[PDB]
Amino acid sequence: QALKKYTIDLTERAEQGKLDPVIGRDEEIRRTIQVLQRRT
Amino acid sequence: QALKKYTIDLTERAEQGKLDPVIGRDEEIRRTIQVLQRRTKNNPVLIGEPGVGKTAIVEGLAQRIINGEVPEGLKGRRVLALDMGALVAGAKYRGEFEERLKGVLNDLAKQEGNVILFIDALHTMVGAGMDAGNMLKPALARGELHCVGATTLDEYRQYIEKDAALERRFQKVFVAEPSVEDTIAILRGLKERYELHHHVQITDPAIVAAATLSHRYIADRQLPDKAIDLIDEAASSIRMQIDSPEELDRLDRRIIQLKLEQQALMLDMLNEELSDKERQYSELEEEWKAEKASLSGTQTIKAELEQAKIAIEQARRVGDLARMSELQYGKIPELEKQLEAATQLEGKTMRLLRNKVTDAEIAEVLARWTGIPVSRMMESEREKLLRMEQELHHRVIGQNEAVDAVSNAIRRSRAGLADPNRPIGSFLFLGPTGVGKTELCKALANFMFDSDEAMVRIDMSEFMEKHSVSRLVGAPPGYVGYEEGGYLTEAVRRRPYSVILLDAVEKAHPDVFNILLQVLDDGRLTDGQGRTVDFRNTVVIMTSNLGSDLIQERFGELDYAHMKELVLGVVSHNFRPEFINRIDEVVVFHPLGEQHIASIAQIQLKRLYKRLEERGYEIHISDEALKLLSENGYDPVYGARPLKRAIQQQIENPLAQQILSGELVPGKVIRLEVNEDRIVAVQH
Amino acid sequence: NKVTDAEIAEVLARWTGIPVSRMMESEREKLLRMEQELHHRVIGQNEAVDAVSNAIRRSRAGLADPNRPIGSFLFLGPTGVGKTELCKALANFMFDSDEAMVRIDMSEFMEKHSVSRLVGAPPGYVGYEEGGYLTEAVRRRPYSVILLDAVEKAHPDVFNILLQVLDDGRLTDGQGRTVDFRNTVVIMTSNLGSDLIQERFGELDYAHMKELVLGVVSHNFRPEFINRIDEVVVFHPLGEQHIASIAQIQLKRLYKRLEERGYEIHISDEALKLLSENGYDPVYGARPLKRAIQQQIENPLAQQILSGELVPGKVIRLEVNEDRIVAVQH
Amino acid sequence: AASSIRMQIDSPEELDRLDRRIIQLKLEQQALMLDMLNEELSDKERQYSELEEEW
Amino acid sequence: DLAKQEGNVILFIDALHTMVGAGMDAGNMLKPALARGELHCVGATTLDEYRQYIEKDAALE
Ligand SMILES: Nc1ncnc2c1ncn2[C@@H]1O[C@H](COP(=O)(O)OP(=O)(O)OP(O)(O)=S)[C@@H](O)[C@H]1O
Ligand SMILES: Nc1ncnc2c1ncn2[C@@H]1O[C@H](COP(=O)(O)OP(=O)(O)OP(O)(O)=S)[C@@H](O)[C@H]1O
Ligand SMILES: Nc1ncnc2c1ncn2[C@@H]1O[C@H](COP(=O)(O)OP(=O)(O)O)[C@@H](O)[C@H]1O
Ligand SMILES: Nc1ncnc2c1ncn2[C@@H]1O[C@H](COP(=O)(O)OP(=O)(O)O)[C@@H](O)[C@H]1O
């Protein structure tokens, strides 16, 4: 499949715990998801 | 086959129903249809300032073509869109671009006029590395190609209307910026679309209020797109607040705290407390799940009704007849009444919060956009405004008349009662210098709007000059500081709701009052760049001090009214009456008694003890020293600025002289006890 | 299937915006009614009613000059006699808004060399890509009434620009294209002879009024520039029935905004009488009326709204106090 | 103007206004479904049919 | 793949300007997929590339 050919899963990396639990910015992530669950 | 390679059928997508039944504009739709159905020059262009959805106007044209609302010369056409950038894939080699374009044109010649071309952003065809208009031009004079132009008026008169041939291949269709009620009707259609999409409910009076406040205040975007985006933003905000759950997270943190505590312990009763709080959390969570199941059932049965609408529109396009009757008479009224039964079931069961959006939520989103509370008179800020004078007299000693006047202005503002076409209030301030005119404006913006800073001071003793006026407006174009904007204006347009101080205008040249005439009649001002920025949602204030001699004479035992009248006659000697008639509202400040000096000094002690607790110091005072300072810091000409400098020269220097002598320990009781002429601090 | 000249005039009107079409009967009724409507929303000043009625009649009948632009009017009157509001009522008739007008606020222009605000900047300076705002706003709305506000505050001979405008009204803009004014209307407002007006609106007719203030403004302007104007009309300081009518109109739009708030508000006519007693002065015209209305109505009214006395669905008779007005809830 | 006249031929205006009238009366009758609105619908549809046949 | 995963996958692309400058060279192939909604990707750059590429195509804006 063409998925694995040219993609990099970061969610696998945090799923395999490779990554950095940075603290904070939760309002900004919230406003991001506010954008993310729009229609336009 | 480049049509397969580069273009996308809208009418496939509208055949798939993917787009908007866009309301209105119907004369312009028809006029588009007129210009299309000619024999030559078949390509009209769409024009305006953006955020009006001309894209969607082409979409609705295609949807009417699907529905056959067109004359009998377009039934069966092909409305296809193409980017100019779509053929800038490989722009190095020679003719490659042009070979793509000619292959497109030969495809369209082979399709023989049954295809209507759409182009968005027609100015993308202007300059592309001659290039592009020098191939379309024979088709576009000959009308064999069926282009549809849609672009922004700035790019129109910037790119095309300086290139004359491309101007004469096209005809203007000026879409207006829509009205209020047009916005309302389209937002009813969009209420439909969003409650189809965003899984929620919307209040339609909140929608028309949202449209009202969007058109009314924010001039940044334009109609109707700003209200569209606001409704989308509020819908998604409440949509995230569907899976917020705040009280569930409170209970979950509580039960996990009690679980950690019990696991640390292993009299107990903590097991019982954990069991009770977990039962509470489980009950709240189960109510949450029941609400989610209710909303999910409501949205699914709404989607099933929408698919029934899709099928009955398939019967409208195709033309089965008993299918229409069957789908209507079965599906519509029973699904509507059980959708309303689910709606009133939610109106029963929704506690953990909503799925509606109200105008309070609109004003929340608005303040998150604006920063300005028109989040309405909610009996906290409202009852602040009911105590607004008593708010001010934290810092406003005496002087109650202007306090009344200012609070009157604010009340006429934030209750929404003003004629908003003048500004919020024009003001002349009079009276003795060194009372807190600046304090008044600071406390105004403080307990009204932000703070003691959210303002613009403009000191008018600079402004003895014609070129001073040239500064504060903005320079004329074809001069130096054109490219930067005016002094006042861009600072206004960043902070749309401020209070502007024009202090001491009597030192300025009398020319300035013309600029104030345009403002204080109108609240709109035309800058260097020829454009106009609103004031009318701000507050403008001038100060003067001329007959403060006469005030210091006669405020002892004359009234307020004839005092006002006499000093306004003096102002008529000063200004033009043609300007002060444009002035709304004038006060007089009066000289204070020394009790007011003592009170302001108490306020200075308050902010001093604030500063020293910020240093860490717990300091009190003998008030005989306050009596001495009240004896010291006055003149009849300046008043309180002598008190401020005396506070400095007898407090801020020697107390720091002893702190940096290492005498003073934070936390000790430090009485500012008197001396013969000085103040001693103690270490207790 | 026969194409007539009315078809062409409508296609032109919809294709540009200029109201070319032959005088249909709703429009002609509306023109007689707009004579009436400018009596309505402008109480007072029926000289101006006459003048601008004649202006738009010489427009829409299609008889006035295809050389000169259509009207040309240098208004004279003292403060607040409705001049700006006259032209806004013209637009709100004609364009169903106030925000379809060219309101070039003229008192910015106190030194000379901001003419480039209105023309554009000549090539090889800054504003060559942008124009000057008058020309752009004309060429987008080719039928639009242009107002030039309080015009004599400026440096005096800015209006060689307006010598072109009122002469032939092709306007050579910055870049070098033609800004044509033949379907438009230029209005100025000035308050020069206003002290003579309030001095001598009595003891003169309309004509010697016009004569003497024309002599004065001719001392102010240049004799070139007075020759270009169609009719130098004069305004008059208003009597107290006009004051009462203005008060009524302000009450109606006040009622409008508060019924948009959602409140049914009446008044004592004695309260109107108190307003009429508390709004008259010859020297200042209409604004002491309006701000007296503002204070002595709105501030107790907004106070009681922020009290929450005002329940909707109640007739709110603005009845008098001893000297003031209370709102009642019945 | 030529294609404008062609579309005003190809539309028709008052015929489609009467068509809006008859479809509104059909909706109103089915919202009622004494009647006599059936008779009024038949009258307006006969009017529209005569106009359409003339068209 | 954007068609296949049906919006269950939202990919991430930082350096949105590098999608703008990639040779439609990459961007306006995907302005369909973001406009149509097979992808809801997240941008990450500085204000200068915002004014340089994101503001400069107003459709991208
Ligand atoms: N009648 C309508 N019904 C539904 N949505 C509409 C309607 N008119 C406009 N819109 C929406 O308004 C949005 C923004 O307007 P646009 O037409 O896209 O702006 P524009 O002026 O065309 O410039 P662009 O390049 O298209 S953003 C559209 O994408 C539509 O979703
Ligand atoms: N006949 C009238 N009908 C309606 N409103 C009027 C009338 N006469 C005066 N007004 C009011 O008077 C004010 C006039 O506003 P403006 O025209 O801007 O003032 P002005 O006429 O420009 O006076 P100056 O000389 O420029 S200060 C408005 O508030 C009008 O409502
Ligand atoms: N809370 C955090 N947890 C883990 N890593 C972090 C955190 N905060 C910052 N970093 C590190 O800081 C670096 C910043 O890089 P990045 O944020 O990707 O650049 P940019 O700020 O341009 O996006 C990252 O490589 C990341 O590993
Ligand atoms: N009403 C008041 N409430 C609180 N403090 C005030 C008040 N009036 C005056 N002050 C004091 O008066 C001084 C006056 O400052 P400023 O406003 O610049 O002078 P003026 O009032 O003469 O323009 C301030 O420094 C402040 O310490």
Numbering used by the authors:
A (entry chain F): 159 to 198
B (entry chain A): 159 to 287, 293 to 407, 409 to 430, 441 to 858
C (entry chain B): 529 to 858
D (entry chain B): 397 to 407, 409 to 430, 441 to 462
E (entry chain F): 265 to 287, 293 to 330
Paper excerpt:
ClpB is composed of tandem AAA domains (AAA1, AAA2), an N-terminal domain (NTD), and a coiled-coil regulatory M-domain, which forms a repressive belt surrounding the AAA1 ring (Carroni et al., 2014, Heuck et al., 2016, Oguchi et al., 2012). ClpB activation requires two signals: (1) interaction with the Hsp70 partner chaperone and (2) binding to substrate protein (Lee et al., 2013, Oguchi et al., 2012, Rosenzweig et al., 2013, Seyffer et al., 2012). Each AAA domain extends a flexible pore loop bearing a conserved aromatic residue, in most cases a tyrosine, which interacts with the backbone of the threading polypeptide.
Three-dimensional (3D) classification revealed three states with different conformations at the seam and maps were refined to resolutions of 4–6 Å. In all three ClpB-WT states all M-domains are fully visible and enclose the AAA1 ring, in agreement with previous findings (Deville et al., 2017). They adopt a horizontal “repressed” conformation, with head-to-tail contacts around the ring. We noticed that five ATPase sites are always inactive in ClpB-WT compared with four in ClpB-K476C. Substrate engagement by ClpB-WT causes full enclosure of the AAA1 ring by all M-domains in a constrained, horizontal conformation. Cryo-EM structures of substrate-bound ClpB-WT show a more restricted range of movement than ClpB-K476C, altered intra- and inter-ring subunit coupling, and fewer active nucleotide sites, providing a rationale for lower activity. Ordered cycling of AAA domains between different activity states and a large rearrangement of the AAA2 seam subunit and its pore loop are not observed in ClpB-WT.
